[PDB]
Ligand binder design. Sequence first.
Ligand code: NI
Length: 312
Amino acid sequence: NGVLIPHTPIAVDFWSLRRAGTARLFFLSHMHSDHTVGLSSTWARPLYCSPITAHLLHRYLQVSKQWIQALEVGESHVLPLDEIGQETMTVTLLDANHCPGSVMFLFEGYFGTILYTGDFRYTPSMLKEPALTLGKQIHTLYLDNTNCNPALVLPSRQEAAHQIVQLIRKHPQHNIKIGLYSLGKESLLEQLALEFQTWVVLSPRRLELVQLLGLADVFTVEEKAGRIHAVDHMEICHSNMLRWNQTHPTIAILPTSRKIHSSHPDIHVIPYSDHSSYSELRAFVAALKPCQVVPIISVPLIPDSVQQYMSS
Ligand code: NI
């Protein structure tokens, strides 16, 4: 899932080091296990992320803040491309709507104008972002083509949320176990606490996260507080289904974009999405008018100092 922009020392969501080589400036769009394998306490090279992403990275991977230059979303910042006071590059982070601290990167330099989207959930508001409202011509757009594959239909966030609420409605006497990742889908937990007028049980780390986002005070760690429990998706399995049903009638929900067969009758795999649908991408690209689109090619003129920055 990592991308290395050719003929530039730019690696977005890529931390293989040996496979990178020419990379010198590393960017992270959002905290998601898919795009962060290699980050650790030993990662000792510059890294740029969003505010909330800076907090989350430092906490949940123990990366030093020394190598984490956090930049505010929406503004344009200047980053070097060499060891001298010569060439630079402009980065603009835009709200991606994928998850907490999710951003898209807009790079401007000798390579032209590139727009990395990472994972992003298109909203119409996204088109009215000052950085893209100046009629600027993107020369290359790394687009989130996740839902472009017509292999299997996937409902939207709202459709899947409706299905979850109907499911829990049909089972008012049951405990509910929601399988999640380490990021995303906190708003859905808020909405469930609203509709069912209960308290959502969390892990201590998930509680700390929720308080990072400043959500409504509807969460708790006491297991007996509410009938809705939020747990790691790896906990939802047949063995644990029997384990929980040996205490109180329990029902598991697995919101996911994958193709997963339920290994239990009381496990409901709910096809989630968390990505932009095809028609949304159509409107998006038709408004952007990008020179070319690349799923997640012209050779630029690499300046003299940058070529030295790439080889060291
Ligand atoms: Ni993601």
